[PDB]
Amino acid sequence: EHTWPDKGSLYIATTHTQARYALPGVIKGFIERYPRVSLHMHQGSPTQIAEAVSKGNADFAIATEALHLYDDLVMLPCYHWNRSIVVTPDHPLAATSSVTIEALAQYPLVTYTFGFTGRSELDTAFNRAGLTPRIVFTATDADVIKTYVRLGLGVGVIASMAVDPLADPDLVRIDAHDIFSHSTTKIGFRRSTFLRSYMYDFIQRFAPHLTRDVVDTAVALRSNEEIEAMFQDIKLPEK
Amino acid sequence: EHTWPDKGSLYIATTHTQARYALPGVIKGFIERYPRVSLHMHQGSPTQIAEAVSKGNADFAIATEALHLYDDLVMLPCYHWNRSIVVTPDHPLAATSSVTIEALAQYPLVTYTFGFTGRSELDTAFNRAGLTPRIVFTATDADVIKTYVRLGLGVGVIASMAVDPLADPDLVRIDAHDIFSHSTTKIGFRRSTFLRSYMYDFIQRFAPHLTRDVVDTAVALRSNEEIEAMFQDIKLPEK
Ligand SMILES: CC(=O)N[C@@H](CO)C(=O)O
Ligand SMILES: CC(=O)N[C@@H](CO)C(=O)O
Ligand SMILES: CC(=O)N[C@@H](CO)C(=O)O
Ligand SMILES: CC(=O)N[C@@H](CO)C(=O)O
């Protein structure tokens, strides 16, 4: 068929959100193409993942947040993303349209946990507005979040790609584009790492703008600052 | 209605499996009963959770695994549980009936991650049988596991309570009672922690055998060994 005889290994250390909503499509198309490549996927917290990759079990690091601290690995930007609001139909916010961050700060919150950017761009959203949010639930999975929202435990704040009406019919989705700054999902990998052809192909599928010539140009650069100062002129995918 | 005016707080640090399949029922019945109790649920890794509770942010610790290392907190046993095998209909194991651990060690594995008992009683299942399992996927969520099984990435090994035919119709469930030793979900909490009445009620809902007189008897005991040497005569719930 349309397969490559490429023999090698690919270890990906990523988070739950990426593994659940962003990767499944890329992974299937990859394994159909590279049958002789042993694909490993491990998950996954921004601290470990940053750990597993710098030294040195995983090849690539797919996460939003804390990678750096590690200055060791090249970083490329994959997409931007922002969170939506999920509530039950009986909840006030399902009646009110276009909500502010002050109106949201009234209710018990059900969001991500500390260490994940779904929060980090959330903690400094209230800090800035001089607000203290009542967060009664923190988790890494949005399904668990969406679960406890249905119980009427509190208002849910999850990634937009984690909520779908076919999948989630009983919940009212409220876009929070303006309320929160968008988060940037990146891909991390050491410089010593020899980039195989299937690795470029994977990066391509996950981030279309990251073609082979683009990756090589960012890699050869001194630091990750020049890399991020290379993409400020281009509009990355928003999901 | 049937509510209590009890005012207080309840912080639960638990894992994903517990929060997704074991707790939702208990949580709803609790919040309906204690409206003036601020219920907080945070998740969750056996190391943190053990951390958040010993010192000292969370009141209770609901996890299978590594709690101890902390000798600080009382432990009570809640239930036993074991894992099942999930595959696609086209997979050989869907044809073969009653599989051994040697027949399972043939395939790429999609199970939990290191630090979670879904693995710990899995790593020493092959070690013992003198076997090396090919684990190509590790995660904390069974939904992600079940997801990548459908891609034909490998054979899935998840908790039995995480698989249901209404919920998961396309996957073939294979019970592994004999293959793996059952894991024990426990509840952890410091001795300094004053046990409120609603706390006993919660423990009761999560573990029926743990009535107030049973909890007090285990708490007052020297160590957690006497506690586990108090329940070897009783058959705990298996889920
Ligand atoms: C179609 C698809 O899989 N898209 C991913 C990104 O590639 C997402 O984030 O939704
Ligand atoms: C950590 C996680 O499960 N999800 C997001 C954060 O919301 C990510 O860091 O990719
Ligand atoms: C009915 C229910 O919620 N049972 C839990 C335990 O209470 C389970 O483990 O399935
Ligand atoms: C850690 C997790 O998500 N689940 C189980 C382990 O399989 C538990 O420790 O309770």
Curated annotation (Swiss-Prot), chains A, B:
It comes from the Bacteria. Its main location: cytoplasm. It is found in: Cytoplasm. GO terms for cellular component: cytoplasm. One of its GO terms (biological process) is regulation of DNA-templated transcription. Keywords: Activator, Amino-acid biosynthesis, Cysteine biosynthesis, Cytoplasm, DNA-binding, Transcription, Transcription regulation. Transmembrane segments: none annotated. The keyword Magnesium does not apply. This protein is a positive regulator of gene expression for the cysteine regulon, a system of 10 or more loci involved in the biosynthesis of L-cysteine from inorganic sulfate. The inducer for CysB is N-acetylserine. CysB inhibits its own transcription. Belongs to the LysR transcriptional regulatory family. This is HTH-type transcriptional regulator CysB. It comes from Salmonella typhimurium (strain LT2 / SGSC1412 / ATCC 700720). The gene is cysB. The chain holds residues 86 to 324 of 324 of the full protein.
